[PDB]
Amino acid sequence: MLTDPIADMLTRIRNATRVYKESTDVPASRFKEEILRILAREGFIKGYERVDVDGKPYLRVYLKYGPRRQGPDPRPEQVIHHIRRISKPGRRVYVGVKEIPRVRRGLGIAILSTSKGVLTDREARKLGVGGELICEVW
Amino acid sequence: PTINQLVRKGREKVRKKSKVPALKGAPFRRGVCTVVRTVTPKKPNSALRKVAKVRLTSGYEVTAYIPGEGHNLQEHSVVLIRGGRVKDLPGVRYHIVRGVYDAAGVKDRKKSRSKYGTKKPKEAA
RNA sequence: AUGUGGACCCGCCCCUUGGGGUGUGUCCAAAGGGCUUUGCCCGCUUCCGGAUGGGCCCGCGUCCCAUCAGCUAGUUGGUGGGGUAAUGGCCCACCAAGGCGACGACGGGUAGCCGGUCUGAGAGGAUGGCCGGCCACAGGGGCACUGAGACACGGGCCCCACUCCUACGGGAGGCAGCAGUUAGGAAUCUUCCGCAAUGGGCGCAAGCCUGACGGAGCGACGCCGCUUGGAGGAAGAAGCCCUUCGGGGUGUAAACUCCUGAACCCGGGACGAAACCCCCGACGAGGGGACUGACGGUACCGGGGUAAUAGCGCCGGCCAACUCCGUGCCAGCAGCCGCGGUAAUACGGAGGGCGCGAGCGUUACCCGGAUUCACUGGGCGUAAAGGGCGUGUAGGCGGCCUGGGGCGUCCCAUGUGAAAGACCACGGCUCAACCGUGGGGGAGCGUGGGAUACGCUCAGGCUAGACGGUGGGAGAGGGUGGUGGAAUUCCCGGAGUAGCGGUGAAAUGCGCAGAUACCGGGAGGAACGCCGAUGGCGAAGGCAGCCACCUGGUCCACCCGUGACGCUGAGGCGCGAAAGCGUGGGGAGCAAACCGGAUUAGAUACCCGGGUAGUCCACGCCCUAAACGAUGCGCGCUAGGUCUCUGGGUCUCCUGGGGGCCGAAGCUAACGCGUUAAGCGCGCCGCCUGGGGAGUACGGCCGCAAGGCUGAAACUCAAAGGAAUUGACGGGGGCCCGCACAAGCGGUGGAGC
RNA sequence: CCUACGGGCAGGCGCCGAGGGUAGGGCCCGUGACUGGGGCGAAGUCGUAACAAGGUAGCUGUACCGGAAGGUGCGGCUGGAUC
RNA sequence: AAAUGU
RNA sequence: AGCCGCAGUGAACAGGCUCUGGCGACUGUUUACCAAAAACACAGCUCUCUGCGAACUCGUAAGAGGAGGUAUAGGGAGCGA
RNA sequence: CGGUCCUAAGGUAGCGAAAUUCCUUGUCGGGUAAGUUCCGACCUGCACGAAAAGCGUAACGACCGGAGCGCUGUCUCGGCG
Ligand SMILES: [Mg+2]
Ligand SMILES: [Mg+2]
Ligand SMILES: [Mg+2]
Ligand SMILES: [Mg+2]
Ligand SMILES: [Mg+2]
Ligand SMILES: [Mg+2]
Ligand SMILES: [Mg+2]
Ligand SMILES: [Mg+2]
Ligand SMILES: [Mg+2]
Ligand SMILES: [Mg+2]
Ligand SMILES: [Mg+2]
Ligand SMILES: [Mg+2]
Ligand SMILES: [Mg+2]
Ligand SMILES: [Mg+2]
Ligand SMILES: [Mg+2]
Ligand SMILES: [Mg+2]
Ligand SMILES: [Mg+2]
Ligand SMILES: [Mg+2]
Ligand SMILES: [Mg+2]
Ligand SMILES: [Mg+2]
Ligand SMILES: [Mg+2]
Ligand SMILES: [Mg+2]
Ligand SMILES: [Mg+2]
Ligand SMILES: [Mg+2]
Ligand SMILES: [Mg+2]
Ligand SMILES: [Mg+2]
Ligand SMILES: [Mg+2]
Ligand SMILES: [Mg+2]
Ligand SMILES: [Mg+2]
Ligand SMILES: [Mg+2]
Ligand SMILES: [Mg+2]
Ligand SMILES: [Mg+2]
Ligand SMILES: [Mg+2]
Ligand SMILES: [Mg+2]
Ligand SMILES: [Mg+2]
Ligand SMILES: [Mg+2]
Ligand SMILES: [Mg+2]
Ligand SMILES: [Mg+2]
Ligand SMILES: [Mg+2]
Ligand SMILES: [Mg+2]
Ligand SMILES: [Mg+2]
Ligand SMILES: [Mg+2]
Ligand SMILES: [Mg+2]
Ligand SMILES: [Mg+2]
Ligand SMILES: [Mg+2]
Ligand SMILES: [Mg+2]
Ligand SMILES: [Mg+2]
Ligand SMILES: [Mg+2]
Ligand SMILES: [Mg+2]
Ligand SMILES: [Mg+2]
Ligand SMILES: [Mg+2]
Ligand SMILES: [Mg+2]
Ligand SMILES: [Mg+2]
Ligand SMILES: [Mg+2]
Ligand SMILES: [Mg+2]
Ligand SMILES: [Mg+2]
Ligand SMILES: [Mg+2]
Ligand SMILES: [Mg+2]
Ligand SMILES: [Mg+2]
Ligand SMILES: [Mg+2]
Ligand SMILES: [Mg+2]
Ligand SMILES: [Mg+2]
Ligand SMILES: [Mg+2]
Ligand SMILES: [Mg+2]
Ligand SMILES: [Mg+2]
Ligand SMILES: [Mg+2]
Ligand SMILES: [Mg+2]
Ligand SMILES: [Mg+2]
Ligand SMILES: [Mg+2]
Ligand SMILES: [Mg+2]
Ligand SMILES: [Mg+2]
Ligand SMILES: [Mg+2]
Ligand SMILES: [Mg+2]
Ligand SMILES: [Mg+2]
Ligand SMILES: [Mg+2]
Ligand SMILES: [Mg+2]
Ligand SMILES: [Mg+2]
Ligand SMILES: [Mg+2]
Ligand SMILES: [Mg+2]
Ligand SMILES: [Mg+2]
Ligand SMILES: [Mg+2]
Ligand SMILES: [Mg+2]
Ligand SMILES: [Mg+2]
Ligand SMILES: [Mg+2]
Ligand SMILES: [Mg+2]
Ligand SMILES: [Mg+2]
Ligand SMILES: [Mg+2]
Ligand SMILES: [Mg+2]
Ligand SMILES: [Mg+2]
Ligand SMILES: [Mg+2]
Ligand SMILES: [Mg+2]
Ligand SMILES: [Mg+2]
Ligand SMILES: [Mg+2]
Ligand SMILES: [Mg+2]
Ligand SMILES: [Mg+2]
Ligand SMILES: [Mg+2]
Ligand SMILES: [Mg+2]
Ligand SMILES: [Mg+2]
Ligand SMILES: [Mg+2]
Ligand SMILES: [Mg+2]
Ligand SMILES: [Mg+2]
Ligand SMILES: [Mg+2]
Ligand SMILES: [Mg+2]
Ligand SMILES: [Mg+2]
Ligand SMILES: [Mg+2]
Ligand SMILES: [Mg+2]
Ligand SMILES: [Mg+2]
Ligand SMILES: [Mg+2]
Ligand SMILES: [Mg+2]
Ligand SMILES: [Mg+2]
Ligand SMILES: [Mg+2]
Ligand SMILES: [Mg+2]
Ligand SMILES: [Mg+2]
Ligand SMILES: [Mg+2]
Ligand SMILES: [Mg+2]
Ligand SMILES: [Mg+2]
Ligand SMILES: [Mg+2]
Ligand SMILES: [Mg+2]
Ligand SMILES: [Mg+2]
Ligand SMILES: [Mg+2]
Ligand SMILES: [Mg+2]
Ligand SMILES: [Mg+2]
Ligand SMILES: [Mg+2]
Ligand SMILES: [Mg+2]
Ligand SMILES: [Mg+2]
Ligand SMILES: [Mg+2]
Ligand SMILES: [Mg+2]
Ligand SMILES: [Mg+2]
Ligand SMILES: [Mg+2]
Ligand SMILES: [Mg+2]
Ligand SMILES: [Mg+2]
Ligand SMILES: [Mg+2]
Ligand SMILES: [Mg+2]
Ligand SMILES: [Mg+2]
Ligand SMILES: [Mg+2]
Ligand SMILES: [Mg+2]
Ligand SMILES: [Mg+2]
Ligand SMILES: [Mg+2]
Ligand SMILES: [Mg+2]
Ligand SMILES: [Mg+2]
Ligand SMILES: [Mg+2]
Ligand SMILES: [Mg+2]
Ligand SMILES: [Mg+2]
Ligand SMILES: [Mg+2]
Ligand SMILES: [Mg+2]
Ligand SMILES: [Mg+2]
Ligand SMILES: [Mg+2]
Ligand SMILES: [Mg+2]
Ligand SMILES: [Mg+2]
Ligand SMILES: [Mg+2]
Ligand SMILES: [Mg+2]
Ligand SMILES: [Mg+2]
Ligand SMILES: [Mg+2]
Ligand SMILES: [Mg+2]
Ligand SMILES: [Mg+2]
Ligand SMILES: [Mg+2]
Ligand SMILES: [Mg+2]
Ligand SMILES: [Mg+2]
Ligand SMILES: [Mg+2]
Ligand SMILES: [Mg+2]
Ligand SMILES: [Mg+2]
Ligand SMILES: [Mg+2]
Ligand SMILES: [Mg+2]
Ligand SMILES: [Mg+2]
Ligand SMILES: [Mg+2]
Ligand SMILES: [Mg+2]
Ligand SMILES: [Mg+2]
Ligand SMILES: [Mg+2]
Ligand SMILES: [Mg+2]
Ligand SMILES: [Mg+2]
Ligand SMILES: [Mg+2]
Ligand SMILES: [Mg+2]
Ligand SMILES: [Mg+2]
Ligand SMILES: [Mg+2]
Ligand SMILES: [Mg+2]
Ligand SMILES: [Mg+2]
Ligand SMILES: [Mg+2]
Ligand SMILES: [Mg+2]
Ligand SMILES: [Mg+2]
Ligand SMILES: [Mg+2]
Ligand SMILES: [Mg+2]
Ligand SMILES: [Mg+2]
Ligand SMILES: [Mg+2]
Ligand SMILES: [Mg+2]
Ligand SMILES: [Mg+2]
Ligand SMILES: [Mg+2]
Ligand SMILES: [Mg+2]
Ligand SMILES: [Mg+2]
Ligand SMILES: [Mg+2]
Ligand SMILES: [Mg+2]
């Protein structure tokens, strides 16, 4: 059923990360795609590969992390410390080019659908647009 | 809740009940003394506090507290009501201002004379 | 009468909702006064423009109660009329039967709306007082007249209420204008000056009117500025406080010595005022010339010149500031927590200290803190909170691909967003408060132009969601009709005695009228032992001997068909244990109420003997609950181990769907939850907002009734609470000791001292 | 009455019409002998219901009863100790 | 069988 | 659209209305000839009798009513929707 | 709440100065300028109380009681035909 697939993607990752895995498979879309992409372009992920599973298409998403720390709980820092849906079907979030995030002071990145597509806070500002804020990541 | 719900109802706006309804958004309210007597406070302590029952303007008759040491209030004595409960004595929610109308200040009081309607005494000669 | 020109009917013309042009026909204009008079000026009448001010209309926005859920006869539309500057059901006829409402009509309560204002990090919340914009009213109502304009505060008619005058012969008035009076109230001023200036009316203009306005007056009501002094001045008097009697404190404070000098006295003295007018030029352009200041002899300037009011709150914690004395749960304090019971930093005074200062406190109210209505920005297992469980209407939300549309959304440009205020920068009153100048920007809304990712939408396409086919599975799922055995009870027969029952022990009770116990027979009702489980089925309530019929849900395998048909669900509807209700049956066992026997201080209880409704059947109501997993539904994601029920499999094992335990990560206040989440997430619904009052009262709906649902407030408390910790206790448990009982020997209790 | 007389004004009639009157409803506030509970308040009276198996495990919906807490019946819940 | 304690 | 009168159901035949108690549910019955009522009756509830040649009633009896009925029937009693 | 005596058992619910209350015109409230009646309350029920039924009940009544409107020769108070 899935009321929101985009959230399901993000959430699938967030679930996968907190157990530190190699890959994370997720149902395919041309809009889920150009949403991921950035996550490789901004290097939040290794990247992905369009594959198929049981005759059905998915997107194996490969997870980056960090250094095997030491002390008790040697589990490394995440790359993705935080990620959450913003605009939702329950409440769609649109913003002018002005009204636009400064996620974790530049260190974070918003992701938005606009009249030119899946821009970022930085980009959309410079192209001068703004649109449907999908999510925030750091 | 959810957001849909929020459009359907919104959030309710608390409201605030007064605790000095005998006054009606007034700082004070003049009245007339009906009874003047002493009462016993909450077990917590014990004494004989001076309170007046006051019939005011608005037909109202409420118990008002008489503060300090002694006064000059028989029955038919014009008064002025302040605002502020006693806590010890239940039911009383109002004070009487001193030195106004038929109720006078506290005799030979040297300290907090702002209350107690006591004028400044002469110190030299 | 004139007609540039205008209006009206019909025409064509363009344009287009009664706009413009024209054709004919017919109707429309008037004014004179003064002169540096023979020329100009102030006016007159028609038309088109302009500009200003409006009228009407439209979209969007604008409070609380659904305990107000249905409203409507000019109501809604039409036709034709009446009316207006003009639209319109604005009014009137006639015709039609429409118009409005969970997107909250209708009704009720409160309110003038905005620019602003206060607070707030913000988002918000609060508010509309002075100033500005608009609406509305002018004692309460109605009405029209005149007019460019009003249905008119200081114009008019009428009715009412009220007050006043009068030879009473009858008539008069409308402060919410400026002051002022009264009354009400906790509370709000002068019955001042002047048109000098600004503005407004009239006039050619002098000039006139202006309680608009410019000033003055009263009030620490607010903001701001300023004074009651400055330098010196002791190892630091006196007095007053403490004191371990040594001393410490007030305290450079005073005194005292120098210096300045608020006030007050003298002199001078404004700006605010330049035009209207006047001269020349044409009274125009122009230079030029002239009158006028209420505030006021005021501010300010000079000189002279005097050390010249300080108060209020607090000093237990929060919260800055400590000591004697008095008091002795008294007198008293208190914003909360709380102080006072003969040693009080918490009362009262005192000394001292902290904090502001012509102010300091208090009360009332708004915002903050309160993330405590949570959009930003919260919760519902046990703290307040998941609807008892389904089905489903509206509604919200919606999977994968490609187009068109570009609604939302995004960008640009443009208009609008008034001034004032606020913010930034600089100036002006000796600073500031005030005040000026200039700049700074939207938000929204219209308009133009773009972009298609997303949502939307129209179209097309698939299959992973969902639905379906075929083959099957398990099951106390439900309804109807039958049927079996054990047992209790009662009746009959036989046999057989002297007691049976019952309890902690007894009694009431039954029994020589033949009881209990035993055999045989008969009638009747209810519930189904072992199987049976920590199991299965159902959405929940709930379902259990056995047979048949009717029948719901659900799981597995095969991967065939439909093509997003989905998820949730306010209302609606249906089901809903027990008790209880109605009408009829039925009634063995049991058993509220009732009676009795015991216990006990009493025992309207507990235990015992009796016992009626009810329990069971049919039909119809009632609709509650610890209706519980105290955990709403659907989908996706995130370790495993073990036990089990039930499918399928190349039957180890694998896989599917259930029922439990321990548990990764993670969550949690902890207890605990954990692929049967309380983890990570999305959709939708229900619900919470301190405790008591209270699931009460009023209203409404439902019910035969008992009652159910919806569901407050005044008032009152300063906590009510959740989980966990250490203790203590238990007529809780396990283990163990003590002359602690028991076992045993002497006494005390009686008598006399 | 005026002529500007096929006119106009007075004047008469009519519809509407402030409000007054009569009648019957609706909502709201105040008030009322008496009555119902509720809250608070002094070391008053009666008992022991609950918290330890609370000395009958407790709570619970409904029903009947009892001076009072409560008791009992039916079904339910464990938020019930205990070799 | 076994109550209470400003 | 009008006309006349003080007046048009122009004469005659036609309810006065409301609020609020007691009693009886209600239509009905009764003391012919002083009481119409809150008395009787009434549908309805309960008790009790009665297995049929019923009980009960009338009659010495025969007989008959009950009833050409048969416990959802019939008789008696009290209460009275 | 307790004690004690007695009883077969000691009047529950609900009503109550009542078609029932002697004292009595009980006391209080309403109504009226004034109310032994009436209506509503209290309970000290001389002497209510559950099928000789208890407490209510919409509708009905030539029953009995209290109040008001309307209207009257009933009346002030009579007069005429
Ligand atoms: Mg005390
Ligand atoms: Mg005390
Ligand atoms: Mg004080
Ligand atoms: Mg002419
Ligand atoms: Mg034209
Ligand atoms: Mg003219
Ligand atoms: Mg002349
Ligand atoms: Mg105008
Ligand atoms: Mg009409
Ligand atoms: Mg028309
Ligand atoms: Mg028209
Ligand atoms: Mg007009
Ligand atoms: Mg609403
Ligand atoms: Mg209104
Ligand atoms: Mg108003
Ligand atoms: Mg505002
Ligand atoms: Mg601000
Ligand atoms: Mg600010
Ligand atoms: Mg705001
Ligand atoms: Mg506002
Ligand atoms: Mg105000
Ligand atoms: Mg004002
Ligand atoms: Mg204004
Ligand atoms: Mg007035
Ligand atoms: Mg006027
Ligand atoms: Mg007027
Ligand atoms: Mg007006
Ligand atoms: Mg006036
Ligand atoms: Mg005035
Ligand atoms: Mg006064
Ligand atoms: Mg005044
Ligand atoms: Mg003034
Ligand atoms: Mg002037
Ligand atoms: Mg002027
Ligand atoms: Mg002029
Ligand atoms: Mg002149
Ligand atoms: Mg004048
Ligand atoms: Mg004047
Ligand atoms: Mg002025
Ligand atoms: Mg001043
Ligand atoms: Mg003052
Ligand atoms: Mg010293
Ligand atoms: Mg000294
Ligand atoms: Mg000095
Ligand atoms: Mg000098
Ligand atoms: Mg001078
Ligand atoms: Mg002048
Ligand atoms: Mg000039
Ligand atoms: Mg000049
Ligand atoms: Mg001078
Ligand atoms: Mg001088
Ligand atoms: Mg001096
Ligand atoms: Mg000096
Ligand atoms: Mg202070
Ligand atoms: Mg402070
Ligand atoms: Mg301190
Ligand atoms: Mg001492
Ligand atoms: Mg002493
Ligand atoms: Mg002392
Ligand atoms: Mg002490
Ligand atoms: Mg203090
Ligand atoms: Mg003190
Ligand atoms: Mg001092
Ligand atoms: Mg001091
Ligand atoms: Mg929120
Ligand atoms: Mg919370
Ligand atoms: Mg939830
Ligand atoms: Mg609880
Ligand atoms: Mg709870
Ligand atoms: Mg539930
Ligand atoms: Mg439900
Ligand atoms: Mg329900
Ligand atoms: Mg739907
Ligand atoms: Mg949709
Ligand atoms: Mg879609
Ligand atoms: Mg703009
Ligand atoms: Mg396109
Ligand atoms: Mg599209
Ligand atoms: Mg399609
Ligand atoms: Mg099949
Ligand atoms: Mg099947
Ligand atoms: Mg089966
Ligand atoms: Mg079956
Ligand atoms: Mg069956
Ligand atoms: Mg025998
Ligand atoms: Mg025998
Ligand atoms: Mg015997
Ligand atoms: Mg015997
Ligand atoms: Mg014998
Ligand atoms: Mg036998
Ligand atoms: Mg199950
Ligand atoms: Mg169950
Ligand atoms: Mg089946
Ligand atoms: Mg297929
Ligand atoms: Mg196909
Ligand atoms: Mg559903
Ligand atoms: Mg509704
Ligand atoms: Mg039904
Ligand atoms: Mg039921
Ligand atoms: Mg039952
Ligand atoms: Mg009953
Ligand atoms: Mg029954
Ligand atoms: Mg029966
Ligand atoms: Mg028995
Ligand atoms: Mg007994
Ligand atoms: Mg006994
Ligand atoms: Mg005794
Ligand atoms: Mg028994
Ligand atoms: Mg619940
Ligand atoms: Mg659940
Ligand atoms: Mg639900
Ligand atoms: Mg199975
Ligand atoms: Mg198998
Ligand atoms: Mg499982
Ligand atoms: Mg576990
Ligand atoms: Mg672990
Ligand atoms: Mg598992
Ligand atoms: Mg509360
Ligand atoms: Mg409350
Ligand atoms: Mg409450
Ligand atoms: Mg209730
Ligand atoms: Mg209830
Ligand atoms: Mg209510
Ligand atoms: Mg009610
Ligand atoms: Mg409920
Ligand atoms: Mg606890
Ligand atoms: Mg222990
Ligand atoms: Mg123990
Ligand atoms: Mg032990
Ligand atoms: Mg011994
Ligand atoms: Mg011995
Ligand atoms: Mg001895
Ligand atoms: Mg002795
Ligand atoms: Mg002895
Ligand atoms: Mg009228
Ligand atoms: Mg009228
Ligand atoms: Mg009325
Ligand atoms: Mg009362
Ligand atoms: Mg007490
Ligand atoms: Mg108990
Ligand atoms: Mg106990
Ligand atoms: Mg006991
Ligand atoms: Mg117990
Ligand atoms: Mg317990
Ligand atoms: Mg019970
Ligand atoms: Mg009783
Ligand atoms: Mg008793
Ligand atoms: Mg209880
Ligand atoms: Mg039970
Ligand atoms: Mg259950
Ligand atoms: Mg006692
Ligand atoms: Mg007529
Ligand atoms: Mg007639
Ligand atoms: Mg006649
Ligand atoms: Mg008639
Ligand atoms: Mg009666
Ligand atoms: Mg009758
Ligand atoms: Mg009756
Ligand atoms: Mg009759
Ligand atoms: Mg007779
Ligand atoms: Mg006779
Ligand atoms: Mg007669
Ligand atoms: Mg009769
Ligand atoms: Mg015969
Ligand atoms: Mg015979
Ligand atoms: Mg015979
Ligand atoms: Mg015969
Ligand atoms: Mg026969
Ligand atoms: Mg019979
Ligand atoms: Mg009778
Ligand atoms: Mg006996
Ligand atoms: Mg009696
Ligand atoms: Mg009794
Ligand atoms: Mg009684
Ligand atoms: Mg009564
Ligand atoms: Mg009486
Ligand atoms: Mg009697
Ligand atoms: Mg009386
Ligand atoms: Mg009276
Ligand atoms: Mg009276
Ligand atoms: Mg009489
Ligand atoms: Mg009476
Ligand atoms: Mg009787
Ligand atoms: Mg009797
Ligand atoms: Mg009897
Ligand atoms: Mg009777
Ligand atoms: Mg009666
Ligand atoms: Mg009658
Ligand atoms: Mg006569
Ligand atoms: Mg005669």
Short mmCIF file of N, CA and C (backbone and C1' of nucleotides) and ligand atoms in Angstrom, two decimals, chain C residues 84-85 147 149-150, ligand 12:
data_model
loop_
_atom_site.label_atom_id
_atom_site.label_comp_id
_atom_site.label_asym_id
_atom_site.label_seq_id
_atom_site.Cartn_x
_atom_site.Cartn_y
_atom_site.Cartn_z
P U C 84 -37.70 58.58 -8.28
"O5'" U C 84 -36.14 58.29 -8.11
"C5'" U C 84 -35.51 58.38 -6.83
"C4'" U C 84 -34.14 57.76 -6.84
"C3'" U C 84 -33.18 58.29 -7.89
"O3'" U C 84 -32.59 59.53 -7.52
"C1'" U C 84 -33.05 55.92 -7.79
P A C 85 -32.56 60.74 -8.57
"O5'" A C 85 -31.09 60.63 -9.19
"C5'" A C 85 -30.86 60.86 -10.58
"C4'" A C 85 -29.54 60.28 -11.02
"C3'" A C 85 -29.48 58.76 -11.12
"O3'" A C 85 -29.96 58.28 -12.36
"C1'" A C 85 -27.56 59.59 -9.97
P G C 147 -34.71 72.30 -4.11
"O5'" G C 147 -33.17 71.96 -3.88
"C5'" G C 147 -32.24 72.97 -3.53
"C4'" G C 147 -31.05 72.38 -2.83
"C3'" G C 147 -30.08 71.59 -3.70
"O3'" G C 147 -29.20 72.42 -4.45
"C1'" G C 147 -30.55 70.35 -1.77
P G C 149 -28.72 66.43 -4.80
"O5'" G C 149 -27.78 65.95 -3.61
"C5'" G C 149 -26.81 64.92 -3.79
"C4'" G C 149 -25.73 65.01 -2.73
"C3'" G C 149 -26.21 64.87 -1.29
"O3'" G C 149 -26.27 63.52 -0.86
"C1'" G C 149 -24.71 66.73 -1.52
P A C 150 -27.66 62.87 -0.37
"O5'" A C 150 -27.69 63.24 1.18
"C5'" A C 150 -26.68 62.77 2.07
"C4'" A C 150 -27.05 62.99 3.51
"C3'" A C 150 -28.41 62.40 3.94
"O3'" A C 150 -28.31 61.86 5.27
"C1'" A C 150 -28.35 64.71 4.43
MG MG H 12 -30.80 61.55 -3.33
#
